[PDB]
């Protein structure tokens, strides 16, 4: 229960929820149809950044969270033109995302809103590099438990 209640006031998560809902629908689309609806996904990504800059949120965190969104969506429709390349000039983010996350988890209370965002994205199935590491699921699930308890408590992790 802590995740839904805790994340409802999270301005980072709110600014990206339209895009997340749009993507959850497109996953049940033919692959060619998903490529045609890339302009609206690009629009939603631009709005995510524009809305948070309107709200004076730190640009370093907007970029990091946008980098994660492109990595998450690129991982859903792949395995042409990737979103991470267009927005951050990087072909693959499955490794850097967890290095961004490790720096945030070094300062838990200072970056609570950013950490809730990371918790949710991983809850939506993001795995990045852990998809190709041996025992990668065990390592990833352990990382989610350490972060989820850091945000919500032992009872929320179970
Ligand atoms: Ca909260």
């Amino acid at each position: 229960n802590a995740m839904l209640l805790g994340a409802w006031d999270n301005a980072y998560i709110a600014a990206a929820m339209p895009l997340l809902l749009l993507v959850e629908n497109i996953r049940s689309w033919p692959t060619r149809n998903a490529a045609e609806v890339r302009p609206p996904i690009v629009r939603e990504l631009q709005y995510f950044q524009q809305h948070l800059q309107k709200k004076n949120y730190p640009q370093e965190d907007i970029n990091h969270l946008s980098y994660l969104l492109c990595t998450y969506i690129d991982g859903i429709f792949n395995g042409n033109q990737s979103l991470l390349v267009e927005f951050h000039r990087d072909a693959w983010g499955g490794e850097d995302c967890f290095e961004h996350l490790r720096v945030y988890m070094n300062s838990p209370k200072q970056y609570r809103e950013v950490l809730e965002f990371y918790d949710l994205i991983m809850c939506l199935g993001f795995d990045g590099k852990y998809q190709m590491i041996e025992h990668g699921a065990v390592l990833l699930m352990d990382l989610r438990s350490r972060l989820h308890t850091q945000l919500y408590g032992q009872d929320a992790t179970q």
Side-chain angles (χ1 to χ4, degrees), residues 35-111:
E36 306 184 31
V37 292
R38 185 181 185 269
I41 299 183
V42 173
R43 288 277 204 263
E44 280 305 312
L45 278 167
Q46 293 185 266
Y47 163 84
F48 169 87
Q49 312 173 327
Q50 291 175 342
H51 184 248
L52 299 170
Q53 296 185 225
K54 173 176 157 68
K55 295 297 181 175
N56 289 338
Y57 283 96
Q59 189 62 45
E60 327 88 272
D61 301 334
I62 301 174
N63 293 348
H64 283 162
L65 294 190
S66 177
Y67 187 95
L68 175 72
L69 282 173
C70 304
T71 308
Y72 166 74
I73 302 173
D74 278 339
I76 291 182
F77 302 106
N78 291 325
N80 288 12
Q81 236 323 117
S82 97
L83 298 169
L84 197 69
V85 167
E86 177 169 340
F87 284 91
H88 302 276
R89 320 202 74 85
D90 204 337
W92 184 61
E95 175 178 350
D96 296 350
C97 289
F98 294 110
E99 300 309 311
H100 304 160
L101 170 61
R102 188 192 56 80
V103 181
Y104 287 133
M105 290 181 55
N106 271 319
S107 302
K109 302 176 184 179
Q110 188 182 4
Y111 294 106

Side-chain angles (χ1 to χ4, degrees), residues 5-7 9-10 112 116:
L5 291 170
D9 65 334
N10 190 297
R112 169 168 194 91
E116 295 182 341

